[PDB]
């Protein structure tokens, strides 16, 4: 599981 990026 990864950290949510600043854009979709």
């Amino acid at each position: 599981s990864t950290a949510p990026p600043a854009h979709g």
Epitope: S1, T2, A3, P4, P5, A6, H7, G8
Partner: antibody, heavy 116, light 110 residues
Framework: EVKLHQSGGGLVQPGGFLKISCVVS????????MSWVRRAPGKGLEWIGE????????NYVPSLKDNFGISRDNAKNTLFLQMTKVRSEDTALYFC?????????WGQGTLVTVSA | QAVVTQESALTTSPGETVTLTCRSS?????????ANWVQEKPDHLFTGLIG???NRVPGVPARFSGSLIGDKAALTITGAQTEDEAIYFC?????????FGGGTKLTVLK
């Protein structure tokens, strides 16, 4: 305690090259998208690019893709920025950042001065 | 080559509400521009506030909120504090890169 520790930079001649590093501790570096931005007087903040955890997406602002290169080594928790053919207008403070919903963690900055 | 435009400067007073806006040269700001807001305090102390228009960065106080207002993205600060005197940059996403606006100098009258 999360630390984005930058090193490198300094003085470069016009047309020269430099590689900057950002070593990440306190978070699981292999989970994070990473980004490079630069700050210069009168030039606000400029986003240079970003890189996914697996390096298979590397995005750049189009004007900078020719002479900037972003890479990472997850085994050494390190993000890199390479610059080639630099010009005086590339003088700036360069910052690494990691994404968590937004620009969540920030390095301390690396000064690159381009002057002959 | 898109240009992102912000107010040059805004003045508010402690405890008041201030809204900063972010405009795109391409048309109305939409959710696929994933508006981000970053605060620059002195000594180049950067703090991410908002990503993807609405989402607070973990640990950011509730008095910072993101929205769309008309054709623009917006950052609202409620109960403004003198510590909030800073430069605020917005960034918009254009398919495969971010572009930062020119920043807004926020005064919270000391």
């Amino acid at each position: 305690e999360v630390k984005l520790h930058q090193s490198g930079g300094g003085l470069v001649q016009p047309g020269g090259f430099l590689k900057i590093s950002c070593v990440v501790s306190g978070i699981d570096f292999s989970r994070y998208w990473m980004s490079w931005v630069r700050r210069a007087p009168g030039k606000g903040l400029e986003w240079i690019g970003e890189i996914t955890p697996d390096s298979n997406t590397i995005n750049y602002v189009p004007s900078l893709k020719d002479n900037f290169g972003i890479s990472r080594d997850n085994a050494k928790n390190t993000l890199f920025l390479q610059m080639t053919k630099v010009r005086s207008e590339d003088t700036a403070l360069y910052f690494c950042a990691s994404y968590y919903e937004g620009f969540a963690y920030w390095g301390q900055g690396t000064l690159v001065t381009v002057s002959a | 080559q898109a240009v992102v435009t912000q107010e040059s400067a805004l003045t508010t007073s402690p405890g008041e509400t201030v809204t900063l806006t972010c405009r795109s040269s391409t048309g109305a700001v939409i959710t696929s521009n994933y508006a981000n807001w970053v605060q620059e305090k002195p000594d180049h102390l950067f703090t991410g506030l908002i990503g993807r228009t609405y989402n607070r960065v973990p640990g950011v106080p509730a008095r910072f909120s993101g929205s769309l207002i008309g054709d623009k993205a917006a950052l609202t600060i409620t109960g403004a504090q003198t510590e909030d005197e800073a430069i605020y940059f917005c960034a918009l996403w254009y398919s495969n890169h971010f572009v930062f606006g020119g920043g807004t100098k926020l005064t919270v009258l000391k």
